[PDB]
Amino acid sequence: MNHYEVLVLGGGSGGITMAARMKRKVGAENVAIVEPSERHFYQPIWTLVGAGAKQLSSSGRPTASVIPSGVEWIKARVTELNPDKNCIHTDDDEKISYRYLIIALGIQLDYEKIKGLPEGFAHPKIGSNYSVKTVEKTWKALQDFKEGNAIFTFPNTPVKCAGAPQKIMYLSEAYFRKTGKRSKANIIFNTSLGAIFGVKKYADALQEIIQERNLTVNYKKNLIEVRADKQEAVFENLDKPGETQVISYEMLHVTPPMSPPDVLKTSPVADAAGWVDVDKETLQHRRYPNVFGIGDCTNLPTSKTAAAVAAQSGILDRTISVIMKNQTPTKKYDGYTSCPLVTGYNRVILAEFDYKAEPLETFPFDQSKERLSMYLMKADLMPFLYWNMMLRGYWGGPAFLRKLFHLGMSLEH
Numbered sequence: 001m002n003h004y005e006v007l008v009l010g011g012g013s014g015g016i017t018m019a020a021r022m023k024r025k026v027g028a029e030n031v032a033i034v035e036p037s038e039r040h041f042y043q044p045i046w047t048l049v050g051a052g053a054k055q056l057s058s059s060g061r062p063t064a065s066v067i068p069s070g071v072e073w074i075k076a077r078v079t080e081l082n083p084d085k086n087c088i089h090t091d092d093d094e095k096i097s098y099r100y101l102i103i104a105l106g107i108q109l110d111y112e113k114i115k116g117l118p119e120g121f122a123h124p125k126i127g128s129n130y131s132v133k134t135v136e137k138t139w140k141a142l143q144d145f146k147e148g149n150a151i152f153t154f155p156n157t158p159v160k161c162a163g164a165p166q167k168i169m170y171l172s173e174a175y176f177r178k179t180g181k182r183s184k185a186n187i188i189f190n191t192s193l194g195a196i197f198g199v200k201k202y203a204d205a206l207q208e209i210i211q212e213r214n215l216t217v218n219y220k221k222n223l224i225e226v227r228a229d230k231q232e233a234v235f236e237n238l239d240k241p242g243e244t245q246v247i248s249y250e251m252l253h254v255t256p257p258m259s260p261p262d263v264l265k266t267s268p269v270a271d272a273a274g275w276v277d278v279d280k281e282t283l284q285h286r287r288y289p290n291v292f293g294i295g296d297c298t299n300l301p302t303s304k305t306a307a308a309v310a311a312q313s314g315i316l317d318r319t320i321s322v323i324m325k326n327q328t329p330t331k332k333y334d335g336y337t338s339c340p341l342v343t344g345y346n347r348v349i350l351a352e353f354d355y356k357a358e359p360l361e362t363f364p365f366d367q368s369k370e371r372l373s374m375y376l377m378k379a380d381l382m383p384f385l386y387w388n389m390m391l392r393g394y395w396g397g398p399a400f401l402r403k404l405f406h407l408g409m410s411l412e413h
């Protein structure tokens with residue numbers, strides 16, 4: 001019966017970040033991470049990997065190289081959560097108790113919920129930037145595109161980084177004009193939602209881009225079946241239930257339906273929908289006071305992005321400490337998240353907003369414009385910030401920079 005003071009489930013973005021932070025509060029010997037995967041990935045890179053601008057190798061590092069020093073990695077898989085006995089079970093038939101539990105198991109990918117997938121990925125002309133086993137196929141399909149439909153999908157489930165399914169689309173259309181095939185290309189975005197983005201300031205910006213480059217996007221249209229050998233795709237019309245259409249594709253990028261992790265779906269910590277039932281502001285579990293959640297696995301009503309994980313860590317950091325002093329949490333999480341919408345091989349519309357779906361930009365200029373500066377930040381600066389700052393516990397969002405940037409524009413204006 002092993003036991004730790006701070007037990008963190010998941011060794012991904014939120015898990016490694018919280019373990020680094022908790023390594024400073026209690027001892028590094030008082031912290032443990034449960035995670036089966038041997039590679040750790042900065043998944044925001046996979047957008048440009050499938051676009052052909054970066055290598056997949058540079059998006060991953062050995063999990064052992066991102067474990068905070070002195071913290072014991074438990075290379076295993078979480079099997080059961082028993083918060084009424086302050087205990088969890090792992091797939092190595094082990095039972096480890098905690099004093100506080102931090103749940104950071106991310107989101108789950110459900111390619112199987114589409115009929116032809118994952119079987120159809122063995123065939124050419126299809127890929128997905130969301131799985132490491134398929135993001136490289138997206139770039140290959142992009143090069144070997146010669147003539148036909150370029151179709152990009154968005155599922156009928158909650159997703160992580162809701163902008164990614166269209167980023168690859170704009171980069172693909174940009175690649176077609178660059179290589180002389182836009183005249184031979186028919187770009188289509190069949191999304192399950194009824195708007196191109198959740199905040200109008202950037203949805204207006206994307207709408208101008210869609211109309212300028214002659215892109216077709218069909219709202220309330222969900223992919224349900226892939227026929228990879230025949231190069232066909234089946235879409236359900238969510239606005240007219242029962243109405244389906246079969247469309248032949250030359251390149252298909254599917255965004256898989258997603259769900260809470262399987263172990264969390266029925267677990268006693270779960271929402272009615274399967275997400276970790278935390279509080280909007282403290283990120284502390286609503287029923288079990290010694291349980292906390294962060295990232296895609298929880299029911300925080302904001303976009304499940306890595307930027308949100310950074311902002312949540314600083315809030316969660318203070319929440320656990322004020323709890324460890326038996327006081328009451330005061331600092332609230334504003335719902336901050338960012339979605340670096342890559343519109344081309346040198347442009348990014350960096351969207352930033354809060355719980356109220358209202359803009360909250362870090363920089364003094366207008367970020368709803370395609371800007372090269374923001375592309376350089378996302379492409380070259382942020383990967384450095386992720387490995388060396390965030391995962392070390394020295395990054396919790398740009399809030400302290402939004403302050404001085406808007407204090408600097410006080411001297412000016």
Ligand SMILES: Cc1cc2nc3c(=O)[nH]c(=O)nc-3n(C[C@H](O)[C@H](O)[C@H](O)COP(=O)(O)OP(=O)(O)OC[C@H]3O[C@@H](n4cnc5c(N)ncnc54)[C@H](O)[C@@H]3O)c2cc1C
Binds near residue numbers: 009011013076104308
């Ligand atoms: C293609 C793509 C592009 C993206 N681009 C951006 C972007 O530009 N900006 C942005 O902010 N975000 C972006 N994101 C989102 C970002 O990658 C995630 O939101 C972020 O990693 C969330 O961190 P997390 O720890 O909650 O999830 P993860 O980093 O995925 O952590 C989950 C971890 O839990 C582990 N785990 C799963 N099940 C179990 C289990 N049963 N037991 C134990 N461990 C388990 C997994 O192995 C994994 O290591 C993108 C995502 C994708 C897929």
